[PDB]
Structure formats: C-alpha cells, structure tokens
From a paper:
As an FAD-dependent hydroxylase, 4-hydroxyphenylacetate 3-hydroxylase (HpaB) is able to ortho-hydroxylate phenylpropanoids in a molecular chaperon-independent manner and has broad substrate specificity and high catalytic activity. Among them, the HpaBC complex from E. coli (EcHpaBC) has outstanding activities and a broad substrate spectrum. More interestingly, we found that EcHpaB is also capable of hydroxylating a series of phenylpropanoids to generate a wide range of natural products. The highest titers were reported at 62.7 mg/L and 34.7 mg/L in whole-cell catalysis studies, respectively. These results indicate that EcHpaB has a broad substrate spectrum for the hydroxylation of a variety of phenolic compounds.
In this study, we solved the crystal structure of EcHpaB apoenzyme for the first time by X-ray crystallography. EcHpaB is an (α2)2 tetramer, the model consists of residues 2–519 for each of the four-polypeptide chains in the crystallographic asymmetric unit. The N-terminal (MHHHHHHHK) purification tags (residues −7 to 0), Met 1 and the Lys 520 for each chain were not observed in the electron density maps and were excluded from the final model. The tetramer can best be described as dimer of homodimers with chains A and B forming one dimer and chains C and D forming the other. The overall EcHpaB structure contains 30 helices and 16 β strands, which make up five β sheets. Interestingly, the low-homology sequences of EcHpaB and TtHpaB enzymes results in highly similar three-domain architecture and 3-dimensional structure. Structural alignment of EcHpaB and TtHpaB revealed a distinct sequence and structural difference in the loop connecting strands β32 and β33 and covering the entrance of the catalytic site, which consists of eleven amino acids. However, based on the secondary structure prediction, the EcHpaB β32-β33 loop appears to be segmented into three sections, two random coils were separated by a Type IV β-turn. In contrast, the corresponding loop in TtHpaB is a simple random coil. In all cases the crude modeling suggested that the EcHpaB active site could accommodate these substrates in part owing to the plasticity of the β32-β33 loop and the observation that main chain hydrogen bonding to loop residues played a key role in positioning the substrate in the active site.
Residue numbers in the entry:
A (entry chain B), B (entry chain D), C (entry chain A): 2 to 519
Write the structure that this text describes.
Amino acid sequence: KPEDFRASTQRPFTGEEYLKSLQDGREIYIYGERVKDVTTHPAFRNAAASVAQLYDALHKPEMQDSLCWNTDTGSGGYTHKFFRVAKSADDLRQQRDAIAEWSRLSYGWMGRTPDYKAAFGCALGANPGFYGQFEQNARNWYTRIQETGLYFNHAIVNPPIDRHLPTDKVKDVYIKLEKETDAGIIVSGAKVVATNSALTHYNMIGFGSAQVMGENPDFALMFVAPMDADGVKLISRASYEMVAGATGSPYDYPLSSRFDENDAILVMDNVLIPWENVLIYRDFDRCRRWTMEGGFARMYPLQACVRLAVKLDFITALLKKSLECTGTLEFRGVQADLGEVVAWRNTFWALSDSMCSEATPWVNGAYLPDHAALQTYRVLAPMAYAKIKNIIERNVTSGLIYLPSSARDLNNPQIDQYLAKYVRGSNGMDHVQRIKILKLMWDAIGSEFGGRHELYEINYSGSQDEIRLQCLRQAQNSGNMDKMMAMVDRCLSEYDQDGWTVPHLHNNDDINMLDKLL
Amino acid sequence: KPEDFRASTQRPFTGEEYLKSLQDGREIYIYGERVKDVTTHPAFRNAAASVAQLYDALHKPEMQDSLCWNTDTGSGGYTHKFFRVAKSADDLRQQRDAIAEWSRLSYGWMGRTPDYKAAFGCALGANPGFYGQFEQNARNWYTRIQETGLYFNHAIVNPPIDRHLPTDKVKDVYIKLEKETDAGIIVSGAKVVATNSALTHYNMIGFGSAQVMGENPDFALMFVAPMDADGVKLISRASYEMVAGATGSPYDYPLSSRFDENDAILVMDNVLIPWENVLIYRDFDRCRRWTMEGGFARMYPLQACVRLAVKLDFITALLKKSLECTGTLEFRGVQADLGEVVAWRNTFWALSDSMCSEATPWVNGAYLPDHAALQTYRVLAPMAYAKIKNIIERNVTSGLIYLPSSARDLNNPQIDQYLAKYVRGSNGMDHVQRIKILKLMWDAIGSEFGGRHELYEINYSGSQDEIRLQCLRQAQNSGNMDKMMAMVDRCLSEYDQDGWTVPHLHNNDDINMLDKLL
Amino acid sequence: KPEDFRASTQRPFTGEEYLKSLQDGREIYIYGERVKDVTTHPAFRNAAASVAQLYDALHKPEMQDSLCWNTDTGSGGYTHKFFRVAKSADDLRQQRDAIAEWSRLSYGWMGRTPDYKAAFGCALGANPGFYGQFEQNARNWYTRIQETGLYFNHAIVNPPIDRHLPTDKVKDVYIKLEKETDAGIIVSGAKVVATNSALTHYNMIGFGSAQVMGENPDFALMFVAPMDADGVKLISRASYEMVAGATGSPYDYPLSSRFDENDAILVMDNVLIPWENVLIYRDFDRCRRWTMEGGFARMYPLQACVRLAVKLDFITALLKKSLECTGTLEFRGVQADLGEVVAWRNTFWALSDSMCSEATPWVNGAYLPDHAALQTYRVLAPMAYAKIKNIIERNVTSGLIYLPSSARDLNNPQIDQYLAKYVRGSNGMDHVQRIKILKLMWDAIGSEFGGRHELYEINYSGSQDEIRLQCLRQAQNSGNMDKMMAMVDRCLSEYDQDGWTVPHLHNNDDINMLDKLL
C-alpha cells in the first residue's frame, strides 16, 4: 500500500509522497502517549522531514547523475543506484558515491536511512533461490523495493530474557509462530534496537539465535512486516528532537533538532503476515546460513563505511573550525591531533575504495564488495570513533562547558551586551558565530544525541570480541590465512637444527665461536 | 552577614540556614530570563537542596566523628575537618576521610562543593604573611570561613579574547581595577567556568596571566566578591536539572535531576570591592608567585582526588550491577574489563593515601599533602576517566540504547504490559528494576550531564601537555629528578670504552671473539 | 652446609662467601655444554658478581641503617630487613626502603634477587602452623633463611603438555611423588621460567594445578630442593651476558653485560628430597589454599613493586639524559611525554606507600601489605611498561638506530676521527659520552636483554585477563565491592517511577511539560 502514494510508477517517492505514506495510523508510543502522526509529532517531524529531503534529491536533475540509475526491471523508471544489483566493480563505486551523496544531506548523522536496507533488496534480487519455496517472494520484493524506494529497517536483536524464569515462559519473548493459516502466519514476540522504524514502511523481522529455543522451528522465521499492520507497535526511547524542541532551539541543538533516529522496541502482538511476505519458514538451517549466504551482510557494510566517512568529513572540519575559534589551532601539538583525525577520516574512505576495486563476481552476475574490507571497517570504526571523540574533548579545554544556555540569552540585550564583549572568537568572529560553532560541536559529542551516537558507533557490529572474531573467521574461511601460513611454512622449511636447507645462504660453522668459548 | 542566618555561632550552617542565606537577590540569568530565587528555581533548586544535605550532615550525631573537628579559633565550636589547617599527616588523613564522607552524599558527582574552597581558607590561615598589607584580611577570612562553613568558589579562567581587535579593547575583558577609592576598589571584567557559583556565598577572583596585560598592575589583583554585590552577575549555561524536570523524571534522570553544577560566566560590572576583601593589590610579583607559594594549589588536589575516588566507587559498582542486569558478567572478558575499572578505582584511593602518608611540614605548623602524588592524580585522572567510560560503553552492547523514554511508559498499562515481558533483568529482577539501573548508568555517562562530566574530568587541570609538564616540573623542582639522575650517572661511571671501572666485574678481553672473527 | 662458607653465624653471606657457596657442582647446561662453575663461566660470572654486591652491601656500615635489622631468632646477628617478619606498618615501610636500597645496586634491572623469596621465609615464619605435620620444617626454614640470607627462587610454572598424548604419558611432565622412602621423597618432573635459579642455593618447588592431575595426591606437593642435589639440572636459555661478552663490551651493552637473569628450565630426575625439606605432602586442600592463606603471595608484590619503581627511576632519568643528547627536550611535546613517564614512575612509588600505610595485622603479630594496592600494581605495571617503552621509542627518532658497532670504532683513530666530528651531543657533550648514553638506553629497551625485560614485565603476573580477574576477586572477597554497591543501592532507593522517596528533593510534577506537549 505505501507505494501507492506515488503519483508515478517510474520513480521512487518524492519527499511529499513519503511523508504522506507515513500518515497510516501506525501504533507508536512515546512518553506514555500514542503518536497521532509522526509527520507532525514534536519527537519525529523534523527527522521525517530530513529523510524526505533524500527522496526529493532523487528527482533534482543536477543530482541524478550521481544518485540515480535506470531500474533493471523493465519498468523504464529510475532509482537510487544502491537499490539496483551491482554487476561490476565500477557499479559498486557508483553506488558508493550515490550513498555518499545521500549521507551529505544529513552531514553523516542519520545512519539508518533507506539506502541501508536497499542492500537487503539487492540481496533478495541477486540470490532469490536461497529462499527455496519463497524464491518468488524474494524476486517480487526486490522489484518493489528497487522501483519504489521503499524504506525498510532491520529488527533482529532479541529482547533480554530473565534466566530465572521457567524456560517455557522465557521463550514467549522471542518472535515465534502462533498460528499457521491459509492467509499467512500469525506471529508474536519482540525485537529491540529498531532504529528509526517509526519512519519506515516495512521492517524485516530477522532470525536471532537463542539457546533456549533449542529445536522448535516456530522460532526459525524471517518475514517482512508493514509498519501499519495491526498488532505491530513501537515503544520509543526518549526523543532528543522533542527535548531540543521543548527546552532548546535549532541554534542550541542544531543536530538533535533534525537528525534524531529513535531506537525503539518493536512489539508483535498476534500479527498476521501474509504468505507473500514470508522469506524463511520454520527452517533453522536457512536461518543459520542466511548471514553468510543470503548476501545482505556481505553488502550493507559498504553503506555503513561510507556514511561514517561522510560523518568523519564533517567532524574533521568541525574540529578544525572549532579550534580556529578557540585559537588553539596555532599550537603544533593541536595541529597534530587534528592531523590524526584526518588520517582516520582517510582510512574509511580508503576502505570503501578497496571494497569496490576488489569486488568479486557472485551469483547471477552480481558483484560483492571486498569482504575483508567489510570486516576491517567493523573492527576499526569503534576504535577510531572513540579516539576522535577523545581528541576533540582534550583540545577544546574550556570553550564548550560554559557556553550560554540559550539563543534567548543572545536575544536579550541585557545579557547579550556582556556576551558580545566576553565570548568573541579568537580569530575575529563575533560571539554569535563562536557560540554557534561550539554548540554545533557539543551537539556532535556531548549532548545526549552525541552520547547516543558514540554508543551506537562503538557497538554497531557487536561486542569488541565478536567483531574481531568475525574478522578472523573471514580470513580463515576465504583462504587468506592459509596463504599467509604458506609463507611462514616456506620460511620454516629453509632451515633445521643443523643449518640452512637452501643452497644460497652461508652456514655459520666457519664463524660460530661457541666451541671456542665453552 | 550570610552566616548570621545561623542560629548559633559555634557551628557551620544547617541545610535550612544555608538555603535561606541564598535568598539574597543575586543577579543570575538563564534561558534569557532572570532567576528570582535559586532555592525555588527549576534549574537550581535540587542542586541547592543536595548541597544543603552536606551542611545538615555536619550536625548529625552519626556523622560527626568522621566529619567534624573543634575549631582552632577559640570559639569552642566545630566545623568540617577540611576547613581547619592540618597540623600533622594524621590530620590530613582525617581530612581526606571527612572529604570522602561528604562526597558520598552526592555519590561523587558534585565536585565543587564547599570543602573544595575550604583549602583556600586554610591557605589563608596557614600563610597569612604572604599578603603583606593584607595579612589581617587573610587571618580574618580564615576565621570566618572556618567557623561558618561559608561556601566559596574560585573564578580564574579568563574569557576568550579576539586577537584581531586593538589591544586597547582586549584588556577590558580581563578583571581590572577601574578606580581606587577610600571605601574599596571598583573592578570590572569577567571569568568563565564559574562552576556552581550560583549556589555559593562568595567567589574568590584569582589572577590569571595573559600576555596582553604586559605591565599595568591594574590587572594584578586577588580579591573576594560576594554573590549579591551590586554589579556581580552570572550568565548560566543550559541546566540539565531543568531539562530533566521539564521533559523527564527522577526515574529517568536520577543524577541530572539533583547534582547539576551549572558552569557560569561571572561578570563584574563596576563592582565595589571593600578593602577587607582585597588580598593582592597591583602586585604582579605576589600574583605570579601565589599558585606556587600561596598554599591553595598544594592543598585542594587532595579534595579533587578523593572526590574522584568516590565517584569511581560509585561507577565501579554501578557497572557491576549493570552487567548483572544484562547477564554479560558471566563472560571472562567482561569480568576482566570490570577488574581494570576496579584497578583504576584503587589507584586514586592509593594516591590519596600517599598524599597523607608522605605529608610535609610547611609554615606555622601546617602540613601539606605529598606534592608528587597530587601531580600524578592530575595526569592519571583524564586517562582513567576516558578509559573507564569506554569500558562501560563497549560492555553494555545493547541495553542502554533502546530504554523506554519515560517512567510514563511504566505507568501506562497499555505500554507496561509489553515492557514487563520483554525487558526483564537477566538476573531475575523485573523490568522496573532493570530499566532503573540502566537509566542510572546512562545518566552517568551518556546524558548531557554525563557528557559534561566527561569533558570536565578530561580538562580539569588544563591541556594534556600542560598537566604532564607540571608533573615534570615538580620532579625537577623538588630534587627528585636529580636523585634519579644520580643513579644514571653512577651507572655510567662504572665502565668506559676500555672496560669496567669497578673491581668486581670481569672484563671480556678473555672471551671477546671479534679479533678471531675479523 | 651452604651457610657454612660464612666466617660468622651472626650475619648473612658476604659476596665472597656467596660466590664460594656456588662452587658446588650444580648441573647446568647452556649452548649444549655443561657449566663447570657458574662463578667463572662466561654466561653467568658477572650476574653472579652483581648479586654478590647485594650481600656485600649488607656489611657496609653506611648501608646498614637502611638495609639491616637485628634478627628475631635470639642469635644476636643481623639480616636484611625483608628477611624478618614485619610486626607493624612502619616495619613494612622500613622493608620497602631496604628493598629499594638493594634494587638500586642493579639500577632496578635484577628482579629475582634474594629479597624476592625472603618473603617466602617470612611467610613460613609468620604462619608455620599452616603446614600441620611440617610446622617445624616451616619454623626451621624461616630461622635458616633469615639468619643466613640463603638465596631461594620460586619454580612454579608447569611445562607445556601435548594434548594428543595419552593422559598416562602426559602425567610424567609434572612434579610428582615417585617413591616414599625413609629419608624423604623421590620426585620427578619439571618447572619452567626458573629465573636466575643458576645462581641460587635452593628452589622452592610449588604446586601448579593442571586438569590432568585430576585426583592423585602424588602431584599435591610443596618442597625445597638444593641446586646441587643429584638429579637437579637446569637447561638455560640464551645468555645475553655471554653474547655481549663474545661480540660486544660493557660500553656497548652496559646492562646485558652484568644484570642478565637466565630464565631456565628446572629438571628433577628422581631427586631425593629429605623430609626436613617437605612442606606440603600429598595434600590437595593445603596446596589449593596456599596461594591465599600461606602469606607469600600477600607479601612478595611489595618487593616487586619497589623493584619496578627503582627501575622506573632509572628509565625516567635515562630518557631525560637521552633527550638532552638528541636536543629534542627543547620541544613542548617531548617534555610532556617525559612528564607522563614521570607520572608513571610516581604511581608505583605511591602504590608502595599505600601498601605500607594501609597494612593490616595478620597472624602471630605479622603485618601484611595492603592487598588492593598489590593487585593494582599487578594490573598497571604491564600497561605502564609498554606505554613508557613506546614513549621512549617515539622520542629518539634516529639517534639509536645508527650508533657505531663497537667501542673498537672509537679506539680506531681512522674511524674515531669522523665520529668525533659527526656524532657529538646536542648539549655540548662529546661523541664518546653521547654514544655511551644512547647505547645504555638501547640496552634498556632494544637489545635482546631489553626485549626480554619488556616480555617479562608484561607477563610477570599472568595473562592480562587473569590479573584483572584477580583485582576483581580481591575487591569482592574483601567486601570492598559490597561497600561500593551499598552506595549505588542507597542512590537507587531514593526514587522510584513515581518520584523521589526522600523529602529534601523537589518532584517535577510542577514543572513537567509532557502533558502540555503531548
């Protein structure tokens, strides 16, 4: 239904059509109250408007070369390049750039925009035979995602379970089959960390292994659920947009006020999923293989790496400008700290380069980005983000903490007269501009919005051990570790306890002095 | 007169009397509006109530052994132990314990409480001759601060200057003498980072060297200013107390709601400072020597190290309880991360031990804490705090980011029915307890309050290079580096290019094979 | 009989008597050859002479105040302070200073000197009743170690086992009882990392649990073995002393040439252990409890922390002297790096202060150092050492790598004429002094000796996880974690989902705006 909000079948949503598609009576709660309409609600309206700008850019002629491709469906339409299966290394590079162009529209701050799950559509389109009996749903869903620009999110993290409850009760926490019917399946359960689901059309409800499920294929499900389906509910976390709106201003919280992606709990209360929305049904094997063989996990980290690099573009220059304000950019050591930030920004662009240039042919003509680069991004990003934030905080030693409370302070001459005198920029800018730049930096790192972004980046791919284990596993599974080991084994083979085994090196029996010494 | 709110002259304020002394028409601005009364204002009332609890504790029979001493003034009254000059190492240990018992009343979160500037009073009482003409002011201010428990703060950080403006304009930014009169001195200027000054009685206005002052003794001042003096004004930063009250709850922000210390700009607009409040007057020599020779900088770091250790007590156990919630404390690697947190917590307690055990006699019977330990605390605290915060964030991989917005969600059964089943604690606690614990942890690290505390801890003592230089200077100025070097010089003297110069070691001419080889 | 080389029973060995006591036909191998006499052998002679200097210091009149105490045995003699049981905190402080004065004699580089296992003697003396049937052996060995200064080492680390071998054959790797006889017990097995055991009188052979022992009390042993007992053999690692002697000089390797402590494999081939040397016999319970209850592990980390702090004294001043040579000490950033090394140096001294000041009474009047400080030292030392070495390496950007090969280059005028011109010190010292200083720095960090010292310091106490787990366990077992948790529980008790539960704070029902906003 959401796609019927388009006035045309040969392009994705416009911003206006996307916003109207959200006025569907989805069930959302925040601060104990039900949200009437996310496009007008104080907690979501600007964040939704920010996403709508992404859809608008798709139809601006000066954007289309970098953003858009013809569809591969025969419709004659166009779409964002990352929504269509890449068939070469050059195609992936064009997708990498289209992702970048969309990230710039939120300065890298919105991470779960529609291009993230576009890789899921491409995975369905490239490898639909994975789903066996549900292959045709996969084919149909790729076309619909590609042509419409449908906004998906991924709901996969299981809720916590009380390890003291009887196992028979603890399992009613996970997504599970309740009833198999001719119209589809009725399911119940919950997922956590449904980031920006309040603004999506559909969520993919994905399998997460839990040891308490044991056997029981009723937990081994993967399906699509529309956000307006009866029994789908979101319980929202606190809204940095609404708090910034209620007690601040755009000047005081310039990022919180427009880029907040609410991390919800998604509840499924006896929801009917039609069969055409089912992708994996009572199949532990396919569920367990999906991460490696489905394609999605091998594609979306291109988007996540690019989005981060665009954010690091922003953070780098925002730091430089902030240090011009305080005047500490004159110092050699301060310049060096900024230089390391530059180096981290460079790193993730270079990884995304390598993802594309080393892309490999897969099934049905599709190309996958370099897999080792995907794992390397996942490992490095939490380290770099923590280091950059530390570099920022130790280099604005004082400018951030005493900033006047409010744009209201500037608009009250009784107060502004003193601000204009005592809080000018060191480089000749006035107090208004200095306070503006530093409040922007604070909203990036120290506001509750900034705190959440740090926590999100650090834990994006899992625990610190898990992402390093996954990097090791890719090296072993691809044969890289064996090739590295062949080099070590060759070295070991060139000598033994009696000397060299290869002819070009000199044994030391003519110069060894141990007999003489002992 | 502020102490005249006391019903007795033989004890410091009670909580009630402290609050009443704050209803004095001090001029404070926040969110473009003037504050009528900090004890009732939504941005300050709970923080003020939290400080008042400190004054209440001084008179509780169960608290008095650890908190209070007789005064040394002949009044026969008692006071907080850190308000009276320590006359032995055991006295410093009793003061460290008195500081600790007071920090626990804010769980380590309020750093700029009345005991911080109590060391300033003790410096004045211990070394009054430093001030020459103003020695009697120093003596009297010691008596007054000690007997009454007056709440001082320290305002020293100069405001920023626009380096493009004519030097004639840059100097009316700094504290400076306007006019000398018989009733006192008239001063103008500003200071930044006036942490919790809105809740104090007096601010001590301290000299900060700026290269633009050059000569001109009109900048070389140190004096005391009351908060309600005509022309004294505070410009407040955003209030985390008020925002948590307006859009949250104590359940949702248990630390922001009661422990926020607003970091203000302090403005002096042609303020009359009476002579009895002047400590250094048109004296660059005394101003530049005061940090090293006055005593205060050699005393207050004991309070800061202890307060940090109490917060680390709290953070350590709160992390443990958070990992009990999520169930990841079962993992060996998670337990190891917690153990490192324990190690950092132990470190700062151990530093405070060394401060007292290695204390040195100073002037007039007063004792100073170990100077090297103070410098070491300053260097380690930014590293430890940043490291601990990272350990916390990477170990609550998911529990923090999707927490329901509001206690209102728990109090709406339509919503609470789902929270009760999907967000239980892993260790058998219910969803209310789990969400509460994790919201307390988030307010510690990720809320705007948590973000500010991180930035405060990192920059407390200056830039990262500056605190390390201060540590180096103390080792050199104290003779420590010379003693270390004497060992290196001894080692170097025991051999030369011909062999050993000491009799007990064997030269290698009987075993050296180089002639043989070459 | 080893003590019978003393000309007096009222003092420990002199250096000369210690060296003579080592000429006993102990069976030691290195470079495939048997060692005739460790006191003359090119791999051990200077290291033995360096230990002999410790014994000589015990009898120099100017050293005796800091090094020596009367014995507590009634003999009327004296001993090194750490060899006699401490009965107060002040005694522990005197011991720490006595340890320091001995470590300064190798500039902190010999770690396994006789004072290390002196804590083992004191443990036997303080808690001899632990050993039941062997209580009198414990008493006698305390008396003997204390009065004579006998040199013990600790051999505890089990050798590796091949997990593919039959469990019956895997068991012959560990120390185990072979036969009980009338004169004592016959044992076989091995231990690894027997650091400097080649220069000791006795080794204490300690129980290390291996899962393959299972039951079988034949493994549950603790006993003392003399180094010259038939069947005791050491298999040595490479000798940095001998390599420095054969291809270097004291000028070229001033630390390798005299302070190398060879980390041997200790082999027991059917060794007869007399009953008077047995401490724990076929007793798993006592073996498992010994680490916690024996006392030794609660004592020797004082010695280890002090030795490290003395080494860090040396490294700190050696780095400063190196940066004067290179001229980079002029830079602000270099001075700051040096300042951080200073801070780490201060930290371990401060930890040793806290060990003594917070000492606790134990059994039979003995005092134990503060336990949390011991665990904190163990955790911080590997971090501090790796950081300090990296700091050193990044600050001598070129001076270390091209240093001329040999003192022979200086003594060849054909070569020295260029060195005198091209390798002077930046601070006016000649090339001989500059090259000498930088080679001393290289031997500390980059020589094979320096490389081993980095590996030893990093792994001294076990794996990085294990030492953090021990720190956590101490916090929990001591009640510290419960005391920290009581603070978190108090904070949690002061509010619920309906507001504050205490009267002094203001509820926000009067300022909450959510009803108005939603």
